[PDB]
XYZ file of N, CA, C and O in Angstrom:
748
model
N 19.370 -21.003 -1.978
C 18.712 -20.686 -0.680
C 17.455 -21.541 -0.499
O 17.370 -22.650 -0.989
N 16.478 -21.030 0.197
C 15.224 -21.810 0.408
C 14.076 -21.191 -0.394
O 13.073 -21.826 -0.652
N 14.213 -19.954 -0.786
C 13.126 -19.298 -1.566
C 11.809 -19.366 -0.791
O 10.971 -20.210 -1.043
N 11.619 -18.486 0.151
C 10.358 -18.502 0.944
C 9.197 -17.963 0.104
O 9.116 -18.202 -1.085
N 8.297 -17.239 0.710
C 7.141 -16.693 -0.057
C 6.685 -15.357 0.542
O 7.126 -14.955 1.599
N 5.800 -14.672 -0.130
C 5.305 -13.364 0.389
C 6.451 -12.544 0.992
O 6.359 -12.080 2.111
N 7.497 -12.385 0.222
C 8.670 -11.603 0.682
C 8.414 -10.103 0.525
O 7.305 -9.669 0.283
N 9.443 -9.309 0.648
C 9.278 -7.835 0.493
C 10.631 -7.187 0.210
O 11.557 -7.296 0.989
N 10.745 -6.505 -0.888
C 12.029 -5.832 -1.225
C 11.733 -4.535 -1.975
O 10.668 -3.967 -1.839
N 12.646 -4.058 -2.773
C 12.366 -2.803 -3.520
C 13.098 -2.843 -4.856
O 13.857 -3.750 -5.118
N 12.890 -1.878 -5.704
C 13.602 -1.893 -7.010
C 15.082 -2.208 -6.771
O 15.776 -2.704 -7.635
N 15.567 -1.923 -5.591
C 16.997 -2.196 -5.284
C 17.164 -3.582 -4.640
O 18.267 -4.055 -4.454
N 16.083 -4.233 -4.289
C 16.205 -5.578 -3.651
C 15.228 -6.596 -4.255
O 14.852 -7.552 -3.606
N 14.831 -6.426 -5.494
C 13.910 -7.402 -6.122
C 14.284 -8.827 -5.726
O 13.849 -9.348 -4.719
N 15.087 -9.452 -6.529
C 15.511 -10.850 -6.240
C 15.291 -11.713 -7.481
O 15.625 -12.880 -7.510
N 14.724 -11.142 -8.503
C 14.466 -11.908 -9.751
C 15.750 -12.525 -10.298
O 16.807 -12.426 -9.709
N 15.650 -13.153 -11.439
C 16.846 -13.790 -12.070
C 16.413 -14.519 -13.346
O 15.604 -14.024 -14.106
N 16.915 -15.703 -13.570
C 16.489 -16.466 -14.774
C 15.501 -17.532 -14.335
O 14.329 -17.490 -14.651
N 15.968 -18.454 -13.567
C 15.068 -19.512 -13.038
C 14.169 -18.899 -11.964
O 13.171 -19.469 -11.570
N 14.540 -17.725 -11.522
C 13.767 -16.957 -10.478
C 12.423 -17.602 -10.142
O 12.325 -18.460 -9.286
N 11.395 -17.176 -10.808
C 10.034 -17.726 -10.555
C 9.630 -17.494 -9.091
O 9.714 -18.384 -8.269
N 9.190 -16.302 -8.763
C 8.780 -16.022 -7.353
C 7.822 -14.849 -7.264
O 7.405 -14.265 -8.242
N 7.496 -14.517 -6.060
C 6.573 -13.378 -5.797
C 7.278 -12.350 -4.908
O 8.125 -12.692 -4.107
N 6.956 -11.092 -5.049
C 7.641 -10.064 -4.215
C 6.681 -8.930 -3.832
O 5.867 -8.494 -4.623
N 6.785 -8.446 -2.621
C 5.898 -7.332 -2.165
C 6.625 -5.995 -2.305
O 7.751 -5.842 -1.874
N 5.997 -5.024 -2.908
C 6.664 -3.701 -3.072
C 5.721 -2.556 -2.680
O 4.515 -2.689 -2.720
N 6.270 -1.429 -2.311
C 5.417 -0.263 -1.928
C 5.447 0.774 -3.057
O 6.023 0.539 -4.100
N 4.848 1.920 -2.867
C 4.880 2.940 -3.955
C 3.793 3.993 -3.742
O 2.833 3.781 -3.028
N 3.937 5.126 -4.377
C 2.925 6.210 -4.245
C 2.129 6.344 -5.543
O 1.307 7.225 -5.691
N 2.393 5.482 -6.480
C 1.696 5.519 -7.797
C 2.304 6.597 -8.693
O 2.475 7.731 -8.296
N 2.633 6.241 -9.904
C 3.236 7.231 -10.836
C 2.399 7.331 -12.113
O 2.374 8.354 -12.767
N 1.719 6.276 -12.478
C 0.894 6.328 -13.723
C -0.069 5.139 -13.786
O 0.255 4.040 -13.381
N -1.252 5.352 -14.299
C -2.238 4.237 -14.397
C -3.052 4.360 -15.687
O -3.203 5.431 -16.238
N -3.576 3.267 -16.171
C -4.378 3.316 -17.425
C -5.635 2.452 -17.289
O -5.570 1.301 -16.904
N -6.776 3.000 -17.604
C -8.038 2.213 -17.496
C -8.420 1.652 -18.869
O -9.582 1.480 -19.177
N -7.451 1.371 -19.696
C -7.761 0.826 -21.051
C -8.143 -0.655 -20.961
O -9.250 -1.038 -21.282
N -7.235 -1.494 -20.538
C -7.553 -2.947 -20.440
C -8.934 -3.153 -19.810
O -9.169 -2.762 -18.685
N -9.804 -3.764 -20.568
C -11.183 -4.033 -20.090
C -11.194 -5.158 -19.051
O -12.191 -5.397 -18.398
N -10.104 -5.858 -18.896
C -10.075 -6.971 -17.901
C -9.382 -6.527 -16.614
O -9.386 -7.228 -15.622
N -8.799 -5.367 -16.624
C -8.105 -4.864 -15.403
C -7.442 -3.517 -15.687
O -7.521 -2.991 -16.779
N -6.780 -2.959 -14.711
C -6.099 -1.652 -14.920
C -4.582 -1.846 -14.869
O -4.084 -2.747 -14.221
N -3.839 -1.015 -15.549
C -2.356 -1.166 -15.532
C -1.684 0.157 -15.166
O -1.847 1.159 -15.834
N -0.919 0.158 -14.112
C -0.218 1.404 -13.693
C 1.242 1.089 -13.367
O 1.650 -0.056 -13.352
N 2.032 2.088 -13.100
C 3.459 1.828 -12.765
C 3.840 2.552 -11.485
O 3.554 3.721 -11.292
N 4.486 1.849 -10.615
C 4.917 2.443 -9.323
C 6.338 2.970 -9.458
O 6.956 2.836 -10.491
N 6.869 3.564 -8.429
C 8.263 4.083 -8.539
C 8.746 4.672 -7.208
O 8.050 4.638 -6.213
N 9.941 5.211 -7.195
C 10.506 5.817 -5.946
C 10.984 4.725 -4.985
O 11.186 3.591 -5.368
N 11.175 5.071 -3.738
C 11.648 4.075 -2.728
C 13.142 3.782 -2.918
O 13.917 3.855 -1.985
N 13.556 3.450 -4.111
C 15.002 3.153 -4.340
C 15.328 3.214 -5.838
O 14.878 4.098 -6.541
N 16.103 2.284 -6.335
C 16.445 2.304 -7.787
C 16.466 0.881 -8.351
O 17.117 0.002 -7.822
N 15.765 0.653 -9.427
C 15.750 -0.707 -10.035
C 16.989 -0.898 -10.912
O 17.571 0.056 -11.387
N 17.395 -2.117 -11.141
C 18.585 -2.350 -11.998
C 18.218 -3.354 -13.079
O 19.041 -3.761 -13.877
N 16.985 -3.779 -13.092
C 16.548 -4.765 -14.075
C 16.390 -4.160 -15.450
O 16.351 -2.962 -15.642
N 16.316 -5.017 -16.401
C 16.171 -4.559 -17.816
C 14.711 -4.290 -18.145
O 14.380 -3.458 -18.967
N 13.857 -4.998 -17.496
C 12.385 -4.843 -17.718
C 12.080 -4.503 -19.180
O 12.794 -4.891 -20.082
N 11.017 -3.781 -19.420
C 10.660 -3.423 -20.823
C 10.560 -1.903 -20.981
O 11.311 -1.155 -20.387
N 9.641 -1.443 -21.787
C 9.489 0.026 -21.999
C 9.128 0.734 -20.689
O 9.906 1.497 -20.150
N 7.949 0.497 -20.174
C 7.531 1.163 -18.904
C 7.258 2.649 -19.155
O 8.166 3.455 -19.214
N 6.015 3.017 -19.302
C 5.684 4.449 -19.550
C 6.405 5.341 -18.535
O 7.103 6.267 -18.894
N 6.250 5.064 -17.267
C 6.936 5.894 -16.232
C 6.373 7.318 -16.230
O 5.552 7.673 -17.052
N 6.813 8.138 -15.313
C 6.305 9.541 -15.265
C 7.300 10.446 -14.527
O 8.049 10.002 -13.681
N 7.312 11.713 -14.848
C 8.257 12.651 -14.175
C 7.567 13.356 -13.003
O 7.986 14.409 -12.569
N 6.514 12.776 -12.492
C 5.771 13.388 -11.344
C 5.737 14.917 -11.447
O 5.946 15.487 -12.500
N 5.445 15.586 -10.363
C 5.373 17.085 -10.415
C 6.746 17.692 -10.738
O 6.963 18.203 -11.819
N 7.666 17.656 -9.816
C 9.014 18.245 -10.082
C 9.589 17.717 -11.402
O 9.670 16.527 -11.621
N 10.003 18.597 -12.276
C 10.588 18.143 -13.572
C 12.104 18.115 -13.464
O 12.821 18.186 -14.442
N 12.585 18.019 -12.264
C 14.048 17.992 -12.032
C 14.471 16.641 -11.449
O 15.157 15.867 -12.088
N 14.068 16.352 -10.242
C 14.448 15.055 -9.611
C 13.539 13.932 -10.113
O 13.585 12.821 -9.623
N 12.714 14.222 -11.077
C 11.788 13.183 -11.621
C 12.483 11.820 -11.678
O 13.549 11.677 -12.243
N 11.888 10.818 -11.090
C 12.511 9.462 -11.103
C 12.866 9.048 -12.532
O 12.617 9.766 -13.481
N 13.446 7.890 -12.694
C 13.821 7.423 -14.058
C 13.269 6.030 -14.318
O 12.769 5.368 -13.428
N 13.379 5.568 -15.530
C 12.885 4.205 -15.847
C 13.544 3.211 -14.896
O 13.079 2.105 -14.709
N 14.628 3.609 -14.288
C 15.327 2.700 -13.335
C 14.854 2.983 -11.908
O 15.645 3.180 -11.005
N 13.566 3.011 -11.700
C 13.036 3.288 -10.335
C 11.597 2.773 -10.206
O 11.188 2.302 -9.165
N 10.826 2.865 -11.256
C 9.417 2.385 -11.191
C 9.216 1.241 -12.186
O 10.072 0.960 -13.000
N 8.091 0.575 -12.131
C 7.850 -0.548 -13.087
C 6.368 -0.611 -13.455
O 5.589 0.232 -13.062
N 5.975 -1.594 -14.218
C 4.542 -1.695 -14.615
C 3.873 -2.883 -13.918
O 4.521 -3.824 -13.507
N 2.573 -2.844 -13.787
C 1.851 -3.966 -13.119
C 0.359 -3.909 -13.461
O -0.153 -2.891 -13.879
N -0.345 -4.995 -13.285
C -1.805 -4.997 -13.601
C -2.576 -5.840 -12.580
O -2.075 -6.819 -12.061
N -3.793 -5.464 -12.291
C -4.604 -6.235 -11.304
C -6.079 -6.234 -11.734
O -6.611 -5.226 -12.154
N -6.738 -7.357 -11.637
C -8.173 -7.417 -12.043
C -8.948 -6.249 -11.424
O -8.734 -5.884 -10.286
N -9.843 -5.659 -12.169
C -10.629 -4.513 -11.632
C -11.251 -4.864 -10.275
O -11.113 -4.132 -9.316
N -11.937 -5.970 -10.183
C -12.562 -6.339 -8.879
C -11.518 -6.264 -7.765
O -11.776 -5.766 -6.689
N -10.333 -6.735 -8.017
C -9.281 -6.658 -6.979
C -8.807 -5.211 -6.879
O -8.276 -4.780 -5.874
N -9.018 -4.455 -7.923
C -8.609 -3.028 -7.914
C -9.640 -2.203 -7.135
O -9.292 -1.315 -6.383
N -10.907 -2.493 -7.300
C -11.935 -1.709 -6.547
C -11.583 -1.737 -5.066
O -11.515 -0.719 -4.406
N -11.355 -2.907 -4.544
C -10.999 -3.019 -3.100
C -9.800 -2.128 -2.785
O -9.847 -1.305 -1.895
N -8.733 -2.269 -3.520
C -7.538 -1.424 -3.266
C -7.922 0.056 -3.359
O -7.480 0.876 -2.577
N -8.738 0.404 -4.312
C -9.140 1.826 -4.467
C -10.197 2.216 -3.431
O -10.035 3.177 -2.707
N -11.279 1.492 -3.355
C -12.336 1.859 -2.368
C -11.718 2.062 -0.986
O -11.983 3.043 -0.321
N -10.883 1.165 -0.554
C -10.243 1.348 0.775
C -9.406 2.618 0.745
O -9.247 3.304 1.735
N -8.879 2.931 -0.403
C -8.050 4.159 -0.538
C -8.944 5.402 -0.625
O -8.669 6.419 -0.021
N -10.003 5.329 -1.376
C -10.901 6.518 -1.496
C -11.253 7.037 -0.101
O -11.534 8.204 0.085
N -11.241 6.176 0.883
C -11.577 6.622 2.261
C -10.473 7.514 2.807
O -10.704 8.397 3.608
N -9.285 7.309 2.350
C -8.160 8.166 2.805
C -8.194 9.460 2.003
O -7.628 10.464 2.385
N -8.863 9.431 0.883
C -8.955 10.638 0.031
C -10.424 10.999 -0.216
O -11.015 11.766 0.517
N -11.017 10.463 -1.253
C -12.437 10.790 -1.548
C -12.888 10.116 -2.839
O -14.049 9.813 -3.034
N -11.971 9.906 -3.723
C -12.310 9.273 -5.034
C -11.308 8.174 -5.383
O -10.377 7.908 -4.648
N -11.500 7.531 -6.502
C -10.570 6.438 -6.912
C -9.508 6.998 -7.857
O -9.714 8.008 -8.501
N -8.371 6.355 -7.943
C -7.288 6.865 -8.843
C -7.886 7.317 -10.176
O -7.387 8.216 -10.821
N -8.950 6.695 -10.585
C -9.600 7.066 -11.863
C -10.191 8.464 -11.782
O -10.302 9.178 -12.758
N -10.580 8.836 -10.612
C -11.189 10.180 -10.408
C -10.088 11.209 -10.198
O -10.216 12.364 -10.553
N -9.006 10.791 -9.618
C -7.880 11.725 -9.373
C -7.228 12.128 -10.695
O -6.569 13.146 -10.789
N -7.411 11.346 -11.722
C -6.803 11.701 -13.036
C -7.126 13.146 -13.369
O -6.300 13.893 -13.852
N -8.331 13.532 -13.104
C -8.758 14.931 -13.388
C -8.174 15.398 -14.723
O -7.965 16.574 -14.943
N -7.907 14.484 -15.619
C -7.336 14.879 -16.933
C -7.235 13.652 -17.839
O -6.519 12.712 -17.554
N -7.943 13.654 -18.932
C -7.880 12.494 -19.859
C -6.433 12.080 -20.069
O -5.963 11.090 -19.543
N -5.730 12.845 -20.832
C -4.298 12.536 -21.100
C -3.432 13.011 -19.930
O -2.489 13.758 -20.106
N -3.746 12.586 -18.736
C -2.941 13.012 -17.556
C -2.569 11.795 -16.704
O -3.108 10.719 -16.877
N -1.650 11.954 -15.791
C -1.247 10.798 -14.938
C -1.262 11.192 -13.458
O -1.299 12.357 -13.114
N -1.231 10.226 -12.580
C -1.241 10.539 -11.122
C 0.190 10.516 -10.573
O 1.067 9.885 -11.131
N 0.435 11.201 -9.488
C 1.811 11.223 -8.904
C 1.914 12.323 -7.844
O 2.732 12.259 -6.948
N 1.090 13.331 -7.942
C 1.139 14.438 -6.942
C 0.053 14.239 -5.880
O -0.758 15.110 -5.637
N 0.027 13.098 -5.247
C -1.012 12.850 -4.207
C -0.380 12.235 -2.957
O -0.586 12.701 -1.854
N 0.380 11.187 -3.119
C 1.016 10.540 -1.938
C 0.267 9.248 -1.607
O 0.065 8.912 -0.457
N -0.151 8.522 -2.609
C -0.893 7.253 -2.352
C 0.084 6.115 -2.043
O 0.229 5.186 -2.810
N 0.750 6.177 -0.923
C 1.708 5.089 -0.572
C 0.940 3.787 -0.315
O 0.008 3.753 0.464
N 1.316 2.718 -0.966
C 0.591 1.431 -0.753
C 1.510 0.238 -1.022
O 2.462 0.329 -1.774
N 1.221 -0.888 -0.427
C 2.063 -2.095 -0.664
C 1.312 -3.049 -1.587
O 0.114 -2.938 -1.753
N 1.985 -3.981 -2.195
C 1.269 -4.911 -3.101
C 2.071 -6.182 -3.316
O 3.283 -6.196 -3.247
N 1.391 -7.239 -3.615
C 2.092 -8.520 -3.880
C 2.063 -8.773 -5.380
O 1.024 -8.714 -6.006
N 3.186 -9.028 -5.971
C 3.190 -9.249 -7.438
C 3.826 -10.581 -7.796
O 4.824 -10.983 -7.233
N 3.286 -11.232 -8.780
C 3.893 -12.503 -9.237
C 4.795 -12.126 -10.399
O 4.338 -11.860 -11.491
N 6.066 -12.034 -10.159
C 6.974 -11.593 -11.244
C 7.826 -12.724 -11.784
O 7.913 -13.799 -11.226
N 8.452 -12.451 -12.880
C 9.326 -13.445 -13.534
C 9.742 -12.936 -14.914
O 9.319 -11.886 -15.355
N 10.573 -13.668 -15.592
C 11.023 -13.228 -16.942
C 10.004 -13.642 -18.003
O 9.139 -14.462 -17.769
N 10.115 -13.083 -19.172
C 9.170 -13.431 -20.269
C 9.923 -13.409 -21.598
O 10.051 -14.415 -22.271
N 10.436 -12.271 -21.967
C 11.201 -12.170 -23.240
C 12.667 -11.855 -22.929
O 13.473 -11.663 -23.816
N 13.018 -11.808 -21.670
C 14.430 -11.514 -21.297
C 14.472 -10.425 -20.220
O 15.529 -9.997 -19.804
N 13.334 -9.960 -19.775
C 13.314 -8.897 -18.746
C 12.527 -9.358 -17.518
O 12.397 -10.536 -17.264
N 12.014 -8.441 -16.744
C 11.248 -8.832 -15.530
C 9.775 -8.428 -15.660
O 9.426 -7.274 -15.512
N 8.905 -9.369 -15.904
C 7.455 -9.029 -16.007
C 6.821 -9.147 -14.615
O 7.165 -10.026 -13.851
N 5.924 -8.267 -14.260
C 5.324 -8.360 -12.895
C 3.809 -8.130 -12.913
O 3.307 -7.234 -13.562
N 3.087 -8.925 -12.171
C 1.607 -8.761 -12.093
C 1.217 -8.530 -10.628
O 1.460 -9.360 -9.776
N 0.634 -7.403 -10.328
C 0.257 -7.120 -8.912
C -1.083 -7.769 -8.560
O -2.037 -7.698 -9.310
N -1.159 -8.394 -7.418
C -2.432 -9.042 -7.003
C -3.032 -8.290 -5.813
O -4.234 -8.260 -5.628
N -2.209 -7.679 -5.002
C -2.741 -6.931 -3.830
C -2.360 -5.452 -3.928
O -1.577 -5.056 -4.767
N -2.912 -4.635 -3.075
C -2.586 -3.181 -3.116
C -3.319 -2.442 -1.993
O -4.487 -2.125 -2.106
N -2.649 -2.172 -0.905
C -3.310 -1.463 0.219
C -2.538 -0.176 0.543
O -1.423 -0.222 1.022
N -3.161 0.938 0.263
C -2.528 2.245 0.525
C -2.711 2.648 1.984
O -3.788 2.558 2.539
N -1.660 3.089 2.605
C -1.740 3.496 4.019
C -1.545 5.010 4.142
O -0.970 5.634 3.273
N -2.023 5.548 5.230
C -1.890 7.004 5.477
C -0.432 7.348 5.797
O 0.351 7.650 4.919
N -0.060 7.294 7.044
C 1.348 7.609 7.417
C 1.621 7.156 8.853
O 2.676 6.639 9.162
N 0.674 7.344 9.732
C 0.875 6.922 11.147
C 0.328 5.508 11.354
O 0.658 4.838 12.313
N -0.508 5.051 10.461
C -1.074 3.680 10.605
C -0.246 2.681 9.796
O -0.341 1.485 9.987
N 0.577 3.159 8.901
C 1.414 2.234 8.099
C 2.153 1.294 9.035
O 2.325 0.125 8.759
N 2.598 1.810 10.145
C 3.331 0.956 11.102
C 2.373 -0.043 11.753
O 2.774 -0.905 12.509
N 1.106 0.055 11.447
C 0.118 -0.897 12.024
C -0.415 -1.785 10.900
O -1.138 -2.735 11.122
N -0.047 -1.469 9.690
C -0.501 -2.265 8.525
C 0.706 -2.950 7.890
O 0.668 -4.113 7.538
N 1.785 -2.228 7.754
C 3.011 -2.822 7.152
C 3.925 -3.360 8.256
O 4.082 -2.751 9.295
N 4.530 -4.494 8.040
C 5.436 -5.067 9.079
C 6.480 -4.029 9.495
O 6.567 -2.970 8.907
N 7.247 -4.371 10.496
C 8.304 -3.455 10.988
C 9.398 -3.310 9.930
O 9.389 -3.989 8.923
N 10.332 -2.423 10.136
C 11.409 -2.233 9.121
C 10.808 -1.626 7.850
O 11.182 -0.549 7.428
N 9.865 -2.302 7.249
C 9.222 -1.757 6.019
C 8.424 -0.499 6.373
O 8.172 0.346 5.537
N 8.028 -0.372 7.611
C 7.248 0.826 8.030
C 8.188 2.017 8.231
O 7.856 3.144 7.919
N 9.366 1.775 8.738
C 10.330 2.892 8.948
C 10.717 3.492 7.591
O 10.699 4.692 7.405
N 11.057 2.665 6.641
C 11.431 3.192 5.299
C 10.325 4.113 4.790
O 10.580 5.138 4.189
N 9.091 3.764 5.043
C 7.970 4.627 4.594
C 8.057 5.973 5.314
O 7.876 7.020 4.726
N 8.352 5.947 6.586
C 8.476 7.201 7.361
C 9.619 8.048 6.793
O 9.440 9.191 6.412
N 10.794 7.484 6.718
C 11.949 8.229 6.167
C 11.685 8.565 4.696
O 12.178 9.543 4.173
N 10.895 7.768 4.028
C 10.590 8.058 2.604
C 9.918 9.430 2.518
O 10.088 10.162 1.565
N 9.165 9.786 3.526
C 8.494 11.115 3.525
C 9.526 12.195 3.843
O 9.423 13.321 3.400
N 10.524 11.852 4.614
C 11.567 12.846 4.967
C 12.534 13.007 3.793
O 13.042 14.077 3.530
N 12.785 11.938 3.091
C 13.718 12.000 1.928
C 13.011 12.591 0.706
O 13.605 13.304 -0.079
N 11.750 12.305 0.538
C 11.020 12.858 -0.638
C 10.651 14.322 -0.382
O 10.636 15.135 -1.282
N 10.362 14.668 0.840
C 10.002 16.083 1.135
C 11.123 17.014 0.665
O 10.876 18.063 0.103
N 12.353 16.638 0.886
C 13.490 17.498 0.448
C 13.706 17.353 -1.062
O 13.807 18.324 -1.785
N 13.780 16.140 -1.537
C 13.995 15.913 -2.994
C 12.821 16.471 -3.804
O 13.008 17.162 -4.787
N 11.614 16.178 -3.404
C 10.441 16.698 -4.160
C 10.540 18.222 -4.274
O 10.212 18.802 -5.289
N 11.012 18.873 -3.243
C 11.154 20.357 -3.298
C 9.892 21.038 -2.765
O 8.791 20.760 -3.200
N 10.047 21.942 -1.836
C 8.860 22.655 -1.289
C 8.103 23.328 -2.433
O 6.893 23.446 -2.408
N 8.808 23.760 -3.447
C 8.129 24.412 -4.602
C 6.879 23.613 -4.967
O 5.801 24.155 -5.117
N 7.013 22.321 -5.092
C 5.833 21.479 -5.425
C 4.861 21.482 -4.244
O 3.659 21.532 -4.414
N 5.376 21.446 -3.044
C 4.484 21.462 -1.851
C 3.558 22.677 -1.917
O 2.475 22.680 -1.366
N 3.978 23.709 -2.596
C 3.129 24.927 -2.712
C 2.061 24.720 -3.787
O 1.017 25.341 -3.775
N 2.319 23.851 -4.725
C 1.343 23.597 -5.803
C 0.112 22.870 -5.263
O -1.001 23.111 -5.687
N 0.303 21.993 -4.316
C -0.863 21.262 -3.730
C -0.619 21.067 -2.238
O -0.689 19.968 -1.725
N -0.300 22.121 -1.542
C -0.016 21.977 -0.093
C -1.080 21.105 0.575
O -0.781 20.185 1.304
N -2.322 21.412 0.343
C -3.432 20.628 0.980
C -3.176 19.130 0.836
O -3.285 18.374 1.779
N -2.862 18.697 -0.345
C -2.621 17.243 -0.563
C -1.400 16.751 0.226
O -1.429 15.701 0.836
N -0.321 17.484 0.203
C 0.902 17.030 0.935
C 0.857 17.413 2.421
O 1.440 16.744 3.252
N 0.192 18.480 2.768
C 0.137 18.894 4.191
C -0.639 17.881 5.035
O -0.704 17.988 6.242
N -1.232 16.910 4.401
C -2.019 15.879 5.148
C -1.351 15.550 6.488
O -2.009 15.203 7.450
N -0.054 15.659 6.563
C 0.648 15.358 7.844
C 1.781 16.364 8.074
O 2.348 16.896 7.140
N 2.115 16.627 9.308
C 3.211 17.598 9.596
C 2.830 18.997 9.105
O 2.029 19.143 8.204
N 3.422 19.983 9.724
C 3.149 21.391 9.354
C 3.924 21.773 8.091
O 4.959 21.210 7.791
N 3.436 22.732 7.353
C 4.148 23.156 6.114
C 3.978 24.663 5.898
O 4.770 25.296 5.230
């Protein structure tokens, strides 16, 4: 093909390969993050669809519901310089109040019950035989403005993503943090 740039797909439409060597934009609500790396933070996204790559370990997370919890074949790992992370978070803290680091509310805990939907650009490629990915951008959107921040088509999937996750996630969880999920629509 021609291999353009700044594309956009999902765990089901990556595009990687062997000679691959490209960049891809993906969305996500955040499933796990770690503030260990002193040069940046590393977290893993998930949902939206299903990955088929071999990738590596990938901590991953079973989010709130311990039933439909996604699988290693849905989310992946990524890292971004803290300075580039502050921007992604500070802009996000405005939609919430604190940074993913504050939402941890638990040393040995992970994030996933909030709804931080955001897009990001990652430079991915193979390394030892799987798909390594490094995120450079990350802008979390609310729900009605996503269609004003994310291009068309990609904005609809986000809308239906709330309709498909609302049923799969299970109202049971909606009762655990209604305030967080009630952010939009009645519940």
